[PDB]
Design a binder for this molecule. Structure first.
Ligand SMILES: [Zn+2]
Ligand SMILES: [Zn+2]
Ligand SMILES: [Zn+2]
Ligand SMILES: [Zn+2]
Ligand SMILES: [Zn+2]
Ligand SMILES: [Zn+2]
Ligand SMILES: [Zn+2]
Ligand SMILES: [Zn+2]
Ligand SMILES: [Zn+2]
Ligand SMILES: [Zn+2]
Lengths: 383, 383, 383, 383, 383
């Protein structure tokens, strides 16, 4: 099966983080340390994505790969290169200081280039072309996901997917070819301004947005479907729950071991005010189905599930007093439910498609009779 | 004087952690990083020792030596090797999935062997033969310990020692040679099934259990003896206090310099629910008398006391809101009492034998007149 | 412009930490890791500076540069070298155990020498001579600082300067050459007892005390001037606020190339008891105006402000429930105010000379319109 | 079987290197890098052992453990601590500048002590007590060695051992307790001047000399026995061949889990002048019959032979123009002969006791018809 | 005493290497690894300095600081950064492709700037201002050097110094204000084109050429003075001997703390053809008087002499077949002569001013009767 690239996932997550529900445009950000995500940020109405990462992490940004969805401003670049970041990737579309307006915006882009030159920071573009079968694979698996299939049991997917394609291309892409060349010249990408490198970057940029609109439509806003109980115990806002579930869906395409991909993400809600664009919520960990590191490949009994990787490679600890949520694309197995409950995760969001089913090596019986953790599943509103 | 080996102490502590007061058998665990204990776990009624370590530590298990008291199951082994552990030692007896019953257990043991070979971490047995004088030295010092000597002032020790020997032999040892050979064949120790490598392992396994029963009897349940106030402020359960004190007694035999060994262990009680087999309690730090690292050797003004090493080489911080207590085998000196009080440790458990004594380079006067820290000492129940 | 030496600042801060408001004398301490300050400690009436560092840091003292204001005692030296400190600088004045009295004091100093020889850590003296222009540069800038200039708007600075010169000479210096030679022979600096290496050390010691009394007088006690609100929300004690502001003033002289030096320090106040000599307050971070690490380069557009450096290279995290204070020598700019507010810093202490100004590349308009953060500025008491 | 310690072997080899045939006494030296010998030196009539190592290695002494047979003088110590050596072990009998005479010698020892104090090099004594069965094991295995058995088939061994004991103890040991007491006071070993540490060190020193005289006598100068060919190509001098064979015989006691021990050493003869005390010859590599660096568990099929270890962990390369010879205690097997011939080793010195024998997992048939390499075997002089 | 800076000495040596006797201009180069010189190169008539370093070192240029005397061309820069060099310092007077002529030269400079921008290696200028007493100190000591004093005992020094000042400033400096201003604009040094940074760089550049002309005149071509034998034996060409002696004379000012600074350099002559600008002659090692590294500090007894540092920190080995010679400013002591003779150095060049003298802790008696090593001393031609 096709496997999503690491730099393509961190780029896709950065674009998705820009769409977190809430002259200078919004910017998402992914902070990656040792090829593991250690933070997902968004630009609040007060601060920037590159400045929130400095507040949240500080000197811990040393030797970190930062993936912005817009080129960071001069103020936001000097602070992160001083922190110690070694790689700053960005989406080659309109930067943070909107060039589609100004003298200040155009002059600021020049300052970034001078700052990029005399500094050792690898401010570059890590965007990569996808595999030919990747876009077909994502569309095929999205229609079979636990969320589209749940609605089917109640044509709509393609209709909703087209709207996301329109919405995510007037936001993450410069439709005009002449406008994009101006931006690429202004942000120090002259070698990418000439064909076929201009068309290669543009095609791949459109290629990744199609994948994002395909994944984002797999957890759709449609006919009042959301995450609700089957009976803290309070549900998240539906916009946040769907956004965090798409993050798990994106991680599900990093799966390497099984033909069916599972991805999980852990989010916790602070009890105090926060400077991030996500609000009180912050990112705890993420993971996907994979073999143990080192190629440790009965074939399913040597895999680390999505929930287990999230609890293993987590940056922030689970605060007992806080409300911490986990978003698993599928029903947690009998192996992961004790770990999720044991780790102190208060709420579980998943798709109750495999619930109650016993297989040869995996079982989904503990999820249904789980006590102590609130389980929200994709379904119609009981009210 | 004989000095306990590092791998022998981590093996003994793992066996002792299995006896923490509270198909698949209980397992103790010692997580060691940079030759320093950074966690003492036990198998809860819900989770496993290997899975609890993943929850408590996560990715911090990287480059860690884990000492189980039973061979971890395939589920627990795949997670810890994924986290990045370095050396998975285990007690070469009945594994976690009990072989003394089943087809599922035998298949699971095979699954570990395939995972052991595919993976990189060294799943080995670090059990070592004891020094010839070690067992005699341990018995000699245990009769002169601050707890047995306190009892005599108010023949019994050997009577209690024999009972522990019987109890710990039917638990940590396979008495039947036929049964043990089946286990060693099943758990991949084929080259330890033939003599003299079969009697060597069996003798050493029995040799360490004799040492454990000797140390465990030095803090005995006898004539309603426990840790009570000499007159939070609430005492720990007597089973927990004695268990944590034997941990300090085990560390006291790593004392390299001074003729009398003192060991200390710090435990803290969380205010929330926990997934560990020890309950709300968790391990903060441990230490013993030793010269400053790097062989920095009066001969007593260059020694780092047991309390000071525990405060120095501690994994978890002392939470001011939590109830944290320290178990020191001997009365804390006038040098360690301010450090224990200053660090925020709420309770002190020790043997008030040296209390009030004024030696040349060491004094025990500040312990008696200590304000702000609850002091529990080995004595009769006042009520 | 003159730039303060890295080891001269850590030496000056250690002397200043000894003056934190509250047989054995007080001792200040600076813990430096990777050339960044990770702790500022004083000596409480119960504990020592070298023992408080062990409590606050523990094993985190590994590979740390410790700058004491007095030579640590044998008890304090053995604990820090056990932790893993590599370099222990000290002020070559009277040590912690006062030699200006005793047989116990003189024997303890000899014990340190054996410990210093036996151990590996570099117990040395890093005091360095100042630049010729440095001493009058500090005096010139101090008279033009935001605090002396504020008073003049309401011939006095030199009277304060002389008083602190007298106060800091009878405290940090041994005026008698006979007494100092005895101390230097006792504390193992026998090669510094002979000229010209005896007058060189004494001259350097006098130059730093002259510089310290110059900086300390820049935030004077003249009249009723203090840090009051420009109408938690409660002000710090005036002695603490002035002391913490002088720390920022000392950091302001590490400014890389900018003509005007700005320094910031962040302090937080815990709600529980503490063992430190500073009380409940602990040190969060420090910084100064400087270009991004790696010598990055309109010239002001590529500089990291004092507040931004403090937020980046901070050891402790900003606890939302605690009281956090930042002391910036100049008025925070429009770049730093969102970061200080975003980071959760509850109170701002700063000057108000530049408030309301609109320069070309910098503005000070958001400070006046700041909501949610208490602002304290150098002014007379409104009451 | 008793396995010789690393620091005991490097100490034993340093003593043996002092006996290389050729006010200030001759000194042997072993240079160890990554626990592998990278040089064997002796004090020439012109230079010192510590100065020859600097010439032969230079900056390569960085992070190396040097094992002298006498405490290096001030000139030798300052040059090797400059190079960057890690540990400088020595035999605590009599330093290079002999104290059994002078004011200059006594003054120099004090200079070494001051140089040790202010430097970070671990100038220590790594001498360790032997295992109880070690001395008996060496004695019994020496009568069954390939060289004593050869003479037997043509009571003498004990007679040769006794005279070696007299010679080696008179040279490597200070017989007078008072005289040795003075030396340990002079060379900064006061803590070893008090019983039982004075008797422990003295007993351990005699234990290693007894072992050395046992190993040295195993390749005895009895009658006209030596290493002769079986009718370059010229034989080494018999004193050199016997000395180098004992080196290969001392390595034989590092054997890992194999009842019969095999050790190898490779020496090459330079075509030009040399500053070493060994003459034109230099040390190429050493190795003992042992398992791979990890574990390899028919059990003989996974053990690395002595010749293979020497060719693997060799410091100097085999120059085709030079005359290089290898000394192996046992006859090279059919597996090692192609490697020795292939590596370019010109001459082989061995014991032809098990030559021509074909065992199950090992054969010795290729040695008899080895073409291109001159084979010298322990035998009586043909003429 | 003033001490020459590291980056300030490697700059001086690079300029001096340009003057090695033999459109595009000759360029000297210093390759520095771990703050130790590992190569001195000059631009041959067929190759460039940056290309000879690649041939001589290859991949060993990784993590090396290269100090060119002219900015390397685009061809030379791309290969050295491909090798993995760390810093490329240069003398900001005129690049390799001379700008004082062309369109090709001006275009080439732009290519270097683009190459430096998108690459990672620090192409910077490490030139530093001299200490105030430095220039006077060198002028005073040079008149008292072994070579000026030798001629004096046979006013001239100042006359030769002025000629070197006239020659070296015409070559290493751009006298015209406008021409140097244009070059700094062309080579991407616009930040140094504005006062006072234009006058600062020009003044410091003049200070070093004055320093170089002062040192280069300390070994003058006055009358028929040269290095001739006191009583291979063949001497070097007088131009080469004087040039190599000035290298030693330059390192004499790197001496840690001695009024009598001593510097040494070792050179060897290959028997075959070479691509370097120095011919078959290549650089072996260099050194100066200094205390042992590691804070080491009868003061002269703990000083590693210039010859000893040269042998310790040599890069190339002393090949017996080649002709290798050492240049020491002072007469080798009785301690360094055995090491120079032992290391295999064939010839010694020195100043026989203090030959035969016997001080307290140093003697110069062994140099007079040194057999086996050819000795050449500064004297009049015996013909
Ligand atoms: Zn921005
Ligand atoms: Zn699962
Ligand atoms: Zn388990
Ligand atoms: Zn104590
Ligand atoms: Zn102290
Ligand atoms: Zn600012
Ligand atoms: Zn010597
Ligand atoms: Zn063999
Ligand atoms: Zn070139
Ligand atoms: Zn010398």
């Amino acid at each position: 099966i096709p496997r999503l690239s690491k730099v393509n996932l961190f780029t896709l997550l950065s674009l998705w983080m820009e769409l977190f529900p809430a002259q200078v445009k919004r910017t998402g950000l992914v902070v990656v340390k040792n090829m593991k995500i250690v933070g997902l940020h968004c630009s609040s109405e007060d601060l920037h994505a590159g400045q929130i990462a400095l507040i949240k992490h500080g000197s811990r940004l040393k030797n970190c790969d930062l993936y912005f969805s817009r080129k960071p401003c001069s103020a936001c670049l000097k602070m992160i290169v001083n922190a110690g970041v070694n790689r700053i990737s960005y989406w080659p579309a309109d930067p943070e200081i909107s060039l589609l307006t100004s003298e200040d915006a155009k002059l600021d882009a020049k300052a970034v280039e001078r700052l990029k030159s005399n500094s050792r920071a690898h401010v570059c573009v890590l965007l990569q072309p996808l595999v030919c079968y990747m876009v077909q694979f994502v569309e095929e698996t999205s229609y079979k996901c636990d969320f589209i299939q749940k609605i089917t049991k109640t044509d709509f997917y393609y209709e909703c997917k087209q709207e996301r394609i329109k919405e995510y291309e007037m936001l993450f892409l410069v439709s005009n070819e002449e406008m994009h060349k101006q931006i690429l010249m202004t942000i120090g990408l002259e070698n990418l301004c000439e064909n076929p490198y201009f068309s290669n970057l543009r095609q791949n940029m459109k290629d990744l947005i199609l994948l994002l609109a395909t994944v984002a439509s797999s957890v759709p806003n449609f006919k009042h479907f959301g995450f609700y109980r089957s009976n803290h115990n309070q549900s998240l806002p539906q916009e946040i729950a769907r956004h965090c579930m798409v993050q798990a869906r994106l991680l599900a395409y990093r799966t390497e071991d099984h033909k069916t991909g599972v991805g999980a993400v852990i989010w916790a809600e602070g009890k105090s005010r926060s400077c991030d664009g996500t609000g009180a919520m912050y990112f705890v960990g993420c993971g996907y189905n994979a073999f143990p590191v080192g190629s440790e490949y009965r074939k399913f009994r040597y895999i680390i599930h999505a929930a287990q990787n999230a609890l293993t490679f987590r940056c922030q600890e689970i605060k007992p007093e806080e409300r911490s949520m986990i978003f698993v694309t599928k029903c947690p197995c009998d192996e992961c439910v004790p770990l999720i409950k044991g780790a102190g995760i208060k709420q579980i969001y998943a798709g109750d498609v495999d619930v109650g089913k016993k297989k040869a090596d995996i079982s989904y019986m503990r999820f249904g009779e789980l006590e102590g953790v609130s389980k929200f599943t994709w379904q119609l509103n009981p009210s």
